[PDB]
UniProtKB/Swiss-Prot annotation, chain C:
Source species of the chain: Giardia intestinalis (strain ATCC 50803 / WB clone C6)
This protein's UniProt keywords: Cytoplasm, Ribonucleoprotein, Ribosomal protein
Ribonucleoprotein is among the record's keywords: yes
Subcellular location: Cytoplasm
A Pfam entry, by short name: Ribosomal_S3Ae
Protein name as it appears in the record: Small ribosomal subunit protein eS1
Lineage: Eukaryota, Metamonada, Diplomonadida, Hexamitidae, Giardiinae
Origin: domain of life: Eukaryota
Subunit note: Component of the small ribosomal subunit. Mature ribosomes consist of a small (40S) and a large (60S) subunit. The 40S subunit contains about 33 different proteins and 1 molecule of RNA (18S). The 60S subunit contains about 49 different proteins and 3 molecules of RNA (25S, 5.8S and 5S).
RNA sequence: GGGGACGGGUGAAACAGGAUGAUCCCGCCGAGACCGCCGGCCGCGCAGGCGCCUGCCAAGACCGCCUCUGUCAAUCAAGGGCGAAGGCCGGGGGCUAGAAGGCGAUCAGACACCACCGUAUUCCCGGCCGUAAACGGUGCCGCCCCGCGGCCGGCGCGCGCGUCCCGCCGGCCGCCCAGGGAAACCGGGAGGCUCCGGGCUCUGGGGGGAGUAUGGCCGCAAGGCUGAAACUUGAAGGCAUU
C-alpha cells in the first residue's frame, strides 16, 4: 500500500517441518511468476538470487543488502535503488559497497544481498501534476500532507511565527544542539544556497 | 675562495649589442687548467691573464 | 660501510636515523642494492617495520654487472618483503625499460604494435606484460616507409599474444625474473614476428604486478634466500 | 659505494635539487634556488643552482652520501617538457664537488593522454 | 588572393584533423598546420658532458639522449625564428634547409 | 570582428523591438 | 612517511599557498576526462567528421571476373534523413580547462591583454536547435585532353626471386606543355569557348539602406528560413605594379 516498489511473495520449503514457508521480499526488476530464486552461500549469480556479498563479484548491482550479518536486509529497498559491490577485503572479511546516496560503507562479507535493481524505477520522474495525486500517495503512507509554512502561522504556533511582513526574521540555519521546539530551520547546515559543483 | 687567474686562448668575439662585452675562452693559468668561456669588459687579447672571481660560471659558447 | 648515524654524528633529523642493508634476489650477481636510512624505534613505529615494503628501482646493469650494451637500459623494481638479520630481503614489484630507450625505439615511417596481456603466474601473482614491437624496412624495398598492411598487423598482434601464452603461461616469479634478466622471451617474440615481416625493437617494455598474494615468505626463500634453488 | 638518488627539478619559476635514499621515502637533504636567491626571476638561474648545490653537497657528505644517481625532471605533465637553465648547473655542481654520478635518467612526467592545458584555444596572447 | 596552394596546412583527403597545442603559446592549432620539429639532444649540456662521464662510476655508461617533438603555431614560431618569412619563390622550396 | 559585432548589435536591437511589440498587441 | 622554509606566478611583479610542516620525494587510493611519440602531400566516410585494449553486430568503396539482369539511368522544386561547435530542455556526472563573476597587476584610464580563483559549460543518455571562413571560398553526371614524379588499395606480366621491375584499374597529390584568364593562378581545369550549343539543378545583376521592416512558416527560447520599399550615393570591389 505505502511502497512504490513492488513486493514479491516467494514460497520456500519448510526446513524444520513438512510444510512450505511463504516469504515476502522487495522485488528486483525481472522477477517473474514461477521464477526459481535460490537463497544461500552456494546460490548462483542470477538476478533475484540471495547470496553473501563476499561471494558476489565486484561491480554487481544488489538490493536489500544486510547492514550487519543476519539482519534480514536494511539497505537498498526503495524503487530503482541499488548498491554496488565495490571491493572485497579478504584479510578483514569485509566488503565495501557504494550505498545509494553515493556513500561507501564496509559491511561483513557474510552479510547477504539480493542481485538486481529494485523494481518501480523512474517512479519519481512523472510529475504528480495535481494536489490530488499527492493526497492519494500520502493517504497510503501517513498524515504528513498538506504542509503549512511556519511563516504563515502565528508566533505562538511556530518559531518562524508571524509578524506584519511574513518573514523568518532570523537566520534559517539552526545549531545541531538546538532543543526540540527550536530545531525548525535548516539543521546544522554546512553550507546553504543553490550553487554548482561537486 | 680567492680569485684564480686564467689566460686567454681564443678571443671569441664582441657581445652585449654594444660590442662592449668581449667573449674569450680562458684556460685556468694554474690548477686543473679547465678551458671555460668568460665575458670580459675593456681591451683584451690572447695571453691576457685576468683573475676570475668564481670561474664555475661560463657564458654561452660563442654567444 | 654505507651507514652514518649508526657509528657517527649527523644533522638533527638524522641523529636518530640508523641505516639498514638492502639485498636483491639471488638471480642478480650484485645482491647488495644499497643502504636505507630509518629513524630508530621511537614508540609505535618499529624501525624494521617502517622499511617493510619499500620498492627500489635498480638498473639490470647494476643488479647484473658486465656488458651495459645489453641490460643497461632495463630497470627492475624490487620491493622489500621481510627484514631479517638487519637486512632487507626483496622480491619482484615490476620491470621496465628506461625513458631514453622508449624514445629511441620510436621513428617516423614505421608501424608500432603495442599490446598488454594479463598473465596469471602459478605463484598467485597477476602480471600485466606490456610488449612493444616496431615494423622495419625490408632488406631491399623501393618505398621509404616501413608501414605494413592489416593482415600483417593482425598476425603480429596475435603472434605476440600467442607466444606470451607459451613463454609465460605456467611461469612462476623466480622463473620470470630469470627470463627477464636474460632476454629469452624478448628473443622468442622477435623470432615469431620476424617470420611474419621484418621487425625491430620487439621486447617486453614493461611488466607490472597487478595483484600480489600476501604471506610471500615461501616466495622469498625460493628467490632471495636461496641461490641453489633458482639455479 | 654509498648511493642515493638526487632528483633535480629543472623548471621555470624555480629549481629543486633534492637527494633521497634510493627508495625515495627518506630525504638526505633538499635545496632550492629561491633559498639561495633574493630575486624571483633569478630563482630558475644557473647561479642559484650552483649556489644551492655545494650547500646541498655539504649536508649530504656529512650524512655520508658519497655518490648519487641523477633523475632530472622538467615541469612536465600537460606543459613544459624542457629543462630550465638551473638543471644543467645542478648536475655540473654535483660533478665538480666530488659526488660520483651513477645513472642519469629523465623523470619528466609525460602524459599517455592529457587533460586540457591552461591558456585557451587562442592561447597566452601576451 | 590565395598565397599558398596547400592553404598553409597539409590537409589532403580529410575534412578535419586532430588539435595540437603550441608548446610556447598554448594555443589550439590543427595537426596539419603545426611546426612538428623532432629534436634528439643529450640529457646534459655538451660543455658538462665529458666531466659527467669521468665522474660517472658506472663503466660503459652512455649519456641518455632526450627525444622530444616541439610543435608550435605560426605566430609562436615566426617570432622564435623556427620558420622565417620567405620570398615568394623561396616559399615554394619545400626542401628542409641544410 | 566588426561584422560579427554588427550582427550581435542588430540581434540585441531586434530582441528589444520584439519586447516593445509584446508590451502592445 | 620523510625532510625543513620558502613556494607559486611573471616579461618584471603582485594576489592567494605555507611550522594546522607548503613546495619537493615516495608509497597508496578515489574521481572523471583523454587516448601521446608512432601520426603522414597515410587512409576511411555522404558531408559534418573519424586514433586505448578486447570482443560482438551490420556495412561500404575499390579490384579481379567468359556470373546474373537488361536500361532498371542523370540531375533534381516539394518532401524525408543527416549536420562541427556553442546554445537549450529533462535525467545524471563533475577530473581538467573555463564564456560569466571576482580578484592582483598594467595604464592617463583598463570592469582588456598577462597572473590567480572559479560558475554555466566541457562528458554520457533521451531529445530540440539547424548554423560555421560547413572552403577546394571551385554543385552533379558524362567525353577528350602533356609530359614528369610521389603515395595508397587491388590485380596482372616478366624475372631469380626483389615488400624488385614493367604495366593496368580506382583514389589522393606535387610540378606543369599547350590552352585559358583582368591577373594571381588553373592545368585529374579555371583546357577543348565572341571559332561561343553534352544533360540537370542552384545563385548573382553598381555600392548602401538591409538581412532592416512587415507578413508567413519553424523552434521551448536563442534564433532559423523566406524577404522589402521609401530613401541615399558615384563609386564600392577584384588582381597586379611602383
Amino acid at each position: 500500500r505505502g511502497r512504490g516498489a513492488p513486493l514479491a511473495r516467494v514460497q520456500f520449503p519448510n526446513m524444520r517441518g513438512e510444510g512450505r514457508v511463504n516469504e515476502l521480499f522487495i522485488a528486483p526488476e525481472g522477477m517473474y511468476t514461477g521464477q526459481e530464486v535460490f537463497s544461500g552461500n552456494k546460490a548462483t549469480l542470477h538476478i533475484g538470487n540471495i547470496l553473501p556479498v563476499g561471494n558476489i563479484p565486484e561491480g554487481t548491482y544488489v538490493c536489500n543488502v544486510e547492514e550487519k550479518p543476519m539482519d534480514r536486509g536494511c539497505l537498498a529497498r526503495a524503487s530503482g535503488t541499488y548498491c554496488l559491490v565495490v571491493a572485497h577485503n579478504m584479510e578483514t572479511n569485509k566488503t565495501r559497497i557504494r550505498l545509494p546516496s553515493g556513500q561507501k560503507k564496509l559491511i561483513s562479507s557474510k552479510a547477504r544481498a539480493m542481485i538486481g535493481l529494485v523494481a518501480g524505477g523512474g517512479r519519481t520522474d512523472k510529475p504528480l501534476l495535481k494536489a490530488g495525486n499527492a493526497y492519494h500517495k500520502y493517504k497510503a503512507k501517513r498524515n504528513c500532507w498538506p504542509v503549512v509554512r511556519g511563516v504563515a502561522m502565528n508566533p505562538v504556533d511556530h518559531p518562524h511565527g508571524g509578524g506584519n511582513h511574513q518573514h523568518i526574521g532570523v537566520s534559517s540555519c539552526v545549531p545541531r544542539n538546538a532543543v526540540p521546539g527550536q530545531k525548525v530551520g535548516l539543521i546544522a547546515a554546512r553550507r546553504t544556497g543553490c550553487s554548482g559543483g561537486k | 675562495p680567492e680569485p684564480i687567474n686564467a689566460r686567454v686562448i681564443e678571443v671569441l668575439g664582441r657581445t652585449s649589442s654594444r660590442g662592449g662585452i668581449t667573449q674569450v675562452k680562458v684556460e685556468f693559468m694554474t690548477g686543473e687548467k679547465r678551458q671555460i668561456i668568460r665575458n670580459v669588459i675593456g681591451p683584451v687579447r690572447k695571453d691576457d691573464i685576468l683573475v676570475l672571481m668564481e670561474s664555475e660560471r661560463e657564458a654561452r659558447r660563442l654567444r | 660501510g654505507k651507514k652514518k648515524i649508526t657509528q657517527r654524528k649527523n644533522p638533527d633529523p638524522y641523529l636518530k636515523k640508523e641505516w639498514y642493508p638492502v639485498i636483491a634476489p639471488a638471480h642478480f650477481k650484485s645482491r647488495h642494492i644499497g643502504q636505507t636510512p630509518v629513524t630508530k624505534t621511537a614508540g609505535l613505529r618499529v624501525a624494521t617495520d617502517v622499511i617493510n615494503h619499500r620498492v627500489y628501482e635498480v638498473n639490470l646493469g647494476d643488479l647484473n654487472p658486465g656488458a651495459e650494451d645489453l641490460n643497461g637500459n632495463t630497470k627492475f623494481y624490487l620491493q622489500t618483503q621481510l627484514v631479517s638479520d638487519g637486512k632487507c630481503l626483496t622480491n619482484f614489484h615490476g620491470m621496465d625499460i628506461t625513458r631514453h630507450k622508449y624514445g629511441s625505439l620510436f621513428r617516423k615511417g614505421c608501424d608500432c604494435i603495442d599490446v598488454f596481456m594479463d598473465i596469471p603466474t602459478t605463484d598467485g601473482y597477476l602480471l600485466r606484460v606490456f610488449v612493444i614491437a616496431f615494423t622495419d624496412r625490408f632488406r631491399f624495398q623501393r618505398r621509404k616507409n616501413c608501414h605494413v598492411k592489416g593482415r600483417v598487423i593482425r598476425m603480429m598482434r596475435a603472434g605476440i599474444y600467442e607466444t606470451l601464452h607459451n613463454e609465460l603461461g605456467k611461469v612462476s616469479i623466480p622463473v620470470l625474473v630469470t627470463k627477464l634478466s636474460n632476454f629469452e622471451v624478448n628473443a622468442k617474440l622477435t623470432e615469431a614476428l620476424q617470420k611474419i615481416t621484418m621487425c625491430r625493437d620487439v621486447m617486453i617494455r614493461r611488466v607490472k604486478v597487478v595483484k600480489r598474494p600476501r604471506n610471500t615468505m615461501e616466495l622469498l626463500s625460493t628467490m632471495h634466500d636461496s641461490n641453489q634453488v633458482r639455479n | 659505494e654509498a648511493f642515493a638518488v638526487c632528483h633535480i627539478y629543472a623548471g621555470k619559476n624555480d629549481t629543486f635539487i633534492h637527494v633521497t635514499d634510493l627508495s625515495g621515502r627518506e630525504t638526505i637533504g633538499r635545496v632550492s634556488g629561491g633559498m639561495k636567491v633574493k630575486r624571483h626571476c633569478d630563482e630558475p638561474s644557473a647561479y642559484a643552482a650552483m649556489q644551492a648545490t655545494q650547500d646541498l653537497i655539504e649536508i649530504i657528505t656529512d650524512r655520508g652520501i658519497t655518490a648519487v644517481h641523477i633523475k632530472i625532471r622538467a615541469d612536465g605533465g600537460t606543459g613544459k617538457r624542457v629543462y630550465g637553465q638551473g638543471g644543467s648547473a645542478a648536475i655540473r655542481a654535483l660533478v665538480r664537488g666530488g659526488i660520483k654520478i651513477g645513472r642519469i635518467e629523465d623523470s619528466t612526467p609525460i602524459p599517455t593522454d592529457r587533460t586540457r592545458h591552461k591558456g585557451g584555444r587562442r592561447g597566452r596572447r601576451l | 588572393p590565395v598565397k599558398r596552394r596547400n592553404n598553409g596546412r597539409s590537409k589532403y583527403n580529410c575534412g578535419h584533423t586532430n588539435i595540437v597545442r603550441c608548446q610556447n603559446c598554448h594555443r589550439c592549432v590543427p595537426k596539419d598546420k603545426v611546426i612538428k620539429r623532432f629534436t634528439i639532444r643529450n640529457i646534459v649540456d655538451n660543455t658538462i658532458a665529458d666531466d659527467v662521464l669521468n665522474a660517472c662510476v658506472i663503466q660503459g655508461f652512455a649519456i641518455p639522449k632526450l627525444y622530444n617533438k616541439v610543435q608550435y603555431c605560426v605566430s609562436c614560431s615566426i617570432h622564435n625564428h623556427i620558420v622565417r618569412v620567405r620570398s615568394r619563390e623561396d616559399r615554394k622550396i619545400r626542401t628542409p634547409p641544410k | 570582428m566588426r561584422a560579427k559585432w554588427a550582427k550581435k548589435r542588430m540581434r540585441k536591437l531586434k530582441r528589444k523591438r520584439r519586447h516593445m511589440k509584446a508590451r502592445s498587441k
